[PDB]
Amino acid sequence: SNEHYLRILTEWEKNSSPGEERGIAFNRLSQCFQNQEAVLNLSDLNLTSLPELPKHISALIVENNKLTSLPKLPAFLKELNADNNRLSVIPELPESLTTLSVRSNQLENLPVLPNHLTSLFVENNRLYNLPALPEKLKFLHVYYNRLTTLPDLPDKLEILCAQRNNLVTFPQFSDRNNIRQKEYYFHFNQITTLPESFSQLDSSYRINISGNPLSTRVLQSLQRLTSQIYFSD
Protein backbone atom coordinates (compact mmCIF):
# COMPACT_ATOMS: atom_id res chain seq x y z
CA SER A 1 0.00 0.00 0.00
CA ASN A 2 2.89 2.33 -0.74
CA GLU A 3 1.27 3.97 -3.77
CA HIS A 4 -1.90 4.52 -1.75
CA TYR A 5 -0.23 6.38 1.12
CA LEU A 6 2.11 8.16 -1.31
CA ARG A 7 -0.95 9.67 -2.99
CA ILE A 8 -2.47 10.91 0.30
CA LEU A 9 0.83 12.63 1.08
CA THR A 10 0.89 14.16 -2.41
CA GLU A 11 -2.65 15.55 -2.15
CA TRP A 12 -1.81 16.99 1.28
CA GLU A 13 1.46 18.51 0.06
CA LYS A 14 -0.24 20.29 -2.86
CA ASN A 15 -2.91 21.81 -0.57
CA SER A 16 -0.37 24.00 1.22
CA SER A 17 -0.57 27.61 2.37
CA PRO A 18 2.27 29.94 1.29
CA GLY A 19 4.11 29.86 4.61
CA GLU A 20 4.28 26.09 5.15
CA GLU A 21 6.97 23.48 4.44
CA ARG A 22 4.93 20.49 3.29
CA GLY A 23 7.73 19.25 1.02
CA ILE A 24 10.10 18.64 3.93
CA ALA A 25 7.17 17.05 5.77
CA PHE A 26 6.45 14.90 2.71
CA ASN A 27 10.00 13.52 2.81
CA ARG A 28 9.94 12.76 6.54
CA LEU A 29 6.46 11.27 6.17
CA SER A 30 7.77 9.19 3.26
CA GLN A 31 10.77 7.60 4.99
CA CYS A 32 8.66 7.03 8.11
CA PHE A 33 6.12 4.92 6.21
CA GLN A 34 8.43 2.94 3.91
CA ASN A 35 11.05 2.17 6.57
CA GLN A 36 8.27 1.50 9.14
CA GLU A 37 10.03 3.76 11.62
CA ALA A 38 8.87 4.36 15.19
CA VAL A 39 9.38 8.14 15.53
CA LEU A 40 7.72 10.66 13.20
CA ASN A 41 9.03 14.19 13.81
CA LEU A 42 7.53 17.10 11.84
CA SER A 43 8.53 19.89 14.21
CA ASP A 44 9.28 23.45 13.07
CA LEU A 45 7.71 23.13 9.62
CA ASN A 46 5.02 25.87 9.79
CA LEU A 47 2.35 23.24 9.14
CA THR A 48 -1.33 24.15 9.49
CA SER A 49 -2.60 20.56 9.16
CA LEU A 50 -1.34 16.99 9.04
CA PRO A 51 -2.25 14.16 6.63
CA GLU A 52 -3.25 10.68 7.77
CA LEU A 53 -0.45 9.47 9.90
CA PRO A 54 1.80 6.46 9.27
CA LYS A 55 0.34 3.67 11.37
CA HIS A 56 2.39 1.57 13.83
CA ILE A 57 4.47 4.61 14.84
CA SER A 58 5.35 4.99 18.52
CA ALA A 59 6.13 8.71 18.90
CA LEU A 60 4.62 11.68 17.05
CA ILE A 61 6.57 14.92 17.49
CA VAL A 62 4.73 17.79 15.78
CA GLU A 63 5.62 20.66 18.08
CA ASN A 64 6.18 24.29 17.04
CA ASN A 65 3.70 24.44 14.16
CA LYS A 66 0.33 26.05 13.36
CA LEU A 67 -1.87 22.97 13.72
CA THR A 68 -5.52 23.66 14.54
CA SER A 69 -6.44 19.95 14.73
CA LEU A 70 -4.79 16.54 14.69
CA PRO A 71 -5.69 13.56 12.48
CA LYS A 72 -6.67 10.18 13.88
CA LEU A 73 -3.77 9.06 16.03
CA PRO A 74 -2.10 5.69 15.38
CA ALA A 75 -3.72 2.97 17.48
CA PHE A 76 -0.50 2.09 19.35
CA LEU A 77 1.06 5.52 19.86
CA LYS A 78 3.37 5.71 22.90
CA GLU A 79 4.16 9.44 23.02
CA LEU A 80 2.44 12.52 21.61
CA ASN A 81 4.21 15.90 21.65
CA ALA A 82 2.09 18.63 20.03
CA ASP A 83 3.49 21.50 22.10
CA ASN A 84 3.08 25.08 20.86
CA ASN A 85 0.32 24.75 18.27
CA ARG A 86 -3.22 26.13 17.93
CA LEU A 87 -5.21 23.02 18.83
CA SER A 88 -8.66 23.39 20.38
CA VAL A 89 -9.47 19.67 20.75
CA ILE A 90 -7.37 16.52 21.13
CA PRO A 91 -8.62 13.38 19.33
CA GLU A 92 -9.40 10.17 21.16
CA LEU A 93 -6.21 8.78 22.65
CA PRO A 94 -4.91 5.22 22.22
CA GLU A 95 -4.95 3.13 25.39
CA SER A 96 -1.21 2.55 24.85
CA LEU A 97 -0.33 6.24 25.23
CA THR A 98 1.99 6.93 28.18
CA THR A 99 3.22 10.49 27.47
CA LEU A 100 0.93 13.31 26.33
CA SER A 101 2.46 16.76 25.78
CA VAL A 102 0.15 19.49 24.46
CA ARG A 103 1.48 22.63 26.13
CA SER A 104 0.85 26.17 24.87
CA ASN A 105 -2.20 25.43 22.73
CA GLN A 106 -5.82 26.62 23.02
CA LEU A 107 -7.42 23.49 24.47
CA GLU A 108 -10.62 24.01 26.44
CA ASN A 109 -11.34 20.30 27.02
CA LEU A 110 -9.37 17.07 27.23
CA PRO A 111 -10.60 13.65 26.09
CA VAL A 112 -10.76 10.61 28.35
CA LEU A 113 -7.26 9.69 29.39
CA PRO A 114 -5.75 6.23 28.85
CA ASN A 115 -4.80 4.16 31.87
CA HIS A 116 -1.09 3.77 31.04
CA LEU A 117 -0.56 7.55 31.01
CA THR A 118 2.35 8.52 33.28
CA SER A 119 3.10 12.03 31.96
CA LEU A 120 0.42 14.62 31.15
CA PHE A 121 1.63 18.12 30.23
CA VAL A 122 -1.20 20.46 29.25
CA GLU A 123 0.10 23.73 30.69
CA ASN A 124 -0.67 27.09 29.05
CA ASN A 125 -4.10 26.17 27.66
CA ARG A 126 -7.71 27.20 28.36
CA LEU A 127 -8.96 24.23 30.36
CA TYR A 128 -11.91 24.77 32.69
CA ASN A 129 -12.20 21.12 33.72
CA LEU A 130 -9.90 18.11 33.67
CA PRO A 131 -10.96 14.49 33.01
CA ALA A 132 -10.42 11.65 35.46
CA LEU A 133 -6.80 10.92 36.15
CA PRO A 134 -5.07 7.65 35.22
CA GLU A 135 -3.92 5.46 38.09
CA LYS A 136 -0.37 5.18 36.71
CA LEU A 137 -0.05 8.97 36.43
CA LYS A 138 3.27 10.25 37.80
CA PHE A 139 3.80 13.79 36.43
CA LEU A 140 0.99 16.27 35.76
CA HIS A 141 1.29 19.88 34.57
CA VAL A 142 -1.93 21.90 34.37
CA TYR A 143 -0.69 25.37 35.23
CA TYR A 144 -1.59 28.49 33.24
CA ASN A 145 -5.15 27.25 32.80
CA ARG A 146 -8.60 28.28 34.08
CA LEU A 147 -9.47 25.27 36.24
CA THR A 148 -11.51 25.69 39.42
CA THR A 149 -11.30 22.14 40.83
CA LEU A 150 -9.15 19.05 40.40
CA PRO A 151 -10.08 15.36 40.17
CA ASP A 152 -8.94 12.87 42.78
CA LEU A 153 -5.16 12.46 42.75
CA PRO A 154 -3.84 9.02 41.75
CA ASP A 155 -1.80 6.76 44.00
CA LYS A 156 1.52 7.22 42.15
CA LEU A 157 1.42 10.98 41.51
CA GLU A 158 4.80 12.51 42.37
CA ILE A 159 4.74 15.98 40.75
CA LEU A 160 1.60 18.10 40.35
CA CYS A 161 2.00 21.61 38.91
CA ALA A 162 -1.43 23.24 39.24
CA GLN A 163 -0.36 26.82 39.97
CA ARG A 164 -1.66 29.86 38.06
CA ASN A 165 -5.22 28.52 37.84
CA ASN A 166 -8.48 29.55 39.53
CA LEU A 167 -8.78 26.72 42.06
CA VAL A 168 -11.09 27.28 45.02
CA THR A 169 -10.63 23.90 46.77
CA PHE A 170 -7.97 21.16 47.08
CA PRO A 171 -8.45 17.78 45.38
CA GLN A 172 -8.79 14.59 47.37
CA PHE A 173 -5.40 13.12 48.26
CA SER A 174 -4.59 9.43 47.95
CA ASP A 175 -4.36 7.16 50.98
CA ARG A 176 -1.86 4.74 49.38
CA ASN A 177 0.72 7.14 47.89
CA ASN A 178 3.83 5.80 49.65
CA ILE A 179 6.57 7.17 47.37
CA ARG A 180 9.38 9.21 48.89
CA GLN A 181 8.49 12.85 48.12
CA LYS A 182 5.34 14.47 46.74
CA GLU A 183 5.78 17.96 45.27
CA TYR A 184 2.34 19.55 44.80
CA TYR A 185 2.16 23.18 43.64
CA PHE A 186 -0.99 25.28 44.07
CA HIS A 187 0.36 28.83 44.24
CA PHE A 188 -1.46 31.76 42.62
CA ASN A 189 -4.97 30.32 42.83
CA GLN A 190 -8.18 31.35 44.62
CA ILE A 191 -8.04 28.93 47.56
CA THR A 192 -9.51 30.64 50.63
CA THR A 193 -9.44 27.89 53.28
CA LEU A 194 -7.45 24.75 54.11
CA PRO A 195 -9.13 21.33 54.12
CA GLU A 196 -9.24 18.87 56.98
CA SER A 197 -7.41 16.36 54.76
CA PHE A 198 -4.14 18.19 55.53
CA SER A 199 -4.03 16.40 58.88
CA GLN A 200 -2.59 12.88 58.75
CA LEU A 201 -0.59 13.99 55.69
CA ASP A 202 3.01 12.78 55.97
CA SER A 203 6.09 14.98 55.62
CA SER A 204 6.48 13.23 52.25
CA TYR A 205 4.15 15.97 50.95
CA ARG A 206 5.67 19.30 49.87
CA ILE A 207 2.82 21.72 49.10
CA ASN A 208 3.03 25.35 47.97
CA ILE A 209 -0.03 27.56 48.49
CA SER A 210 1.47 31.04 48.20
CA GLY A 211 -0.32 33.79 46.29
CA ASN A 212 -3.68 32.37 47.51
CA PRO A 213 -6.21 34.68 49.18
CA LEU A 214 -5.97 32.57 52.37
CA SER A 215 -8.08 34.21 55.07
CA THR A 216 -6.26 36.05 57.86
CA ARG A 217 -7.74 33.35 60.12
CA VAL A 218 -6.43 30.29 58.27
CA LEU A 219 -3.25 32.32 57.74
CA GLN A 220 -2.99 32.72 61.52
CA SER A 221 -3.55 29.03 62.29
CA LEU A 222 -0.98 27.93 59.70
CA GLN A 223 1.39 30.41 61.35
CA ARG A 224 0.96 28.31 64.51
CA LEU A 225 0.94 24.71 63.27
CA THR A 226 4.15 25.40 61.32
CA SER A 227 5.73 26.73 64.56
CA GLN A 228 3.89 18.26 55.63
CA ILE A 229 6.22 20.90 54.18
CA TYR A 230 4.02 23.87 53.26
CA PHE A 231 4.81 27.38 52.03
CA SER A 232 2.17 30.03 52.72
CA ASP A 233 3.54 33.23 51.15
Partner 1 sequence: FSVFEEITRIVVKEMDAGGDMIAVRSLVDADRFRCFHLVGEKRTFFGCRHYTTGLTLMDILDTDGDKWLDGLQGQKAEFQILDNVDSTGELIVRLPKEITISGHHQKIKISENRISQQYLATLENRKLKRELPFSFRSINTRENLYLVTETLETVKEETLKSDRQGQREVTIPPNRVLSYRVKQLVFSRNMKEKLEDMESVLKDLTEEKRKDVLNSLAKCLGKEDIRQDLEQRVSEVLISGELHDPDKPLLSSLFNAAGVLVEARAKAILDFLDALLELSEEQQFVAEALEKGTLPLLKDQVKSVMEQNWDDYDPEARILCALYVVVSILLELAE
What b/e sequence results for 20-40 when a residue is b if at least 16 CB atoms lie within 10 Å of its CB, and e otherwise? Answer: bebeebbebbeebbeeebeeb
- Supply the minimum distance, in Å, between the C-beta of residue 158 and partner 1: 8
CB nearer to partner 1: pick between 143 and 173 = 143
Query: Closest approach of Cβ 161 to partner 1, in Å?
Result: 7
Write the CA distances from 51 to 1, 74, 78, 87, integer angstroms: 16, 12, 19, 15
**Cβ closer to partner 1: 32 or 60?**
60
Calpha distance 185→191 (Å, rounded): 12
- Nearer to partner 1 by Cβ, of 22 and 103: the residue is 103
- Separation between Cα atoms, residue 208 and residue 227, nearest integer Å: 17
Which residues make up the interface to partner 1 (CB under 8 A)?
A: 103-104, 119, 121, 123-124, 139, 141, 143-144, 158-159, 161, 163-164, 179-181, 185, 187-188, 208, 210-211, 231-233
Contact between 162 and 147 under an 8 Å Cβ cutoff? The reply is yes
- Work out how close the CB of 81 gets to partner 1 at its nearest, in angstroms, rounded to a whole number: 10
| Coil, helix or strand at residue 121 | strand
Q: Give the closest residue to 233 by CA, choosing from 216, 217, 209, 215.
A: 209
Minimum separation from the CB atom of position 11 to partner 1 (A):
33
* DSSP string across 162-188: --SS---SPPPPPSS--SS-EEEE--S
Q: How far is the CB of 232 from partner 1 (least distance, A)?
A: 7
Q: Please name the amino acid found at residue 5.
A: Y
Say which DSSP state 137 is in.
-
The type of residue at 29 is: L
- Grouping H, G, I as helix, E, B as strand and the rest as coil, residue 140 is strand
Minimum CB distance to partner 1, residue 9 (Å): 30
| Residue (22 or 141) nearer to partner 1, CB | 141
CB of 82 to partner 1, least distance (A): 14
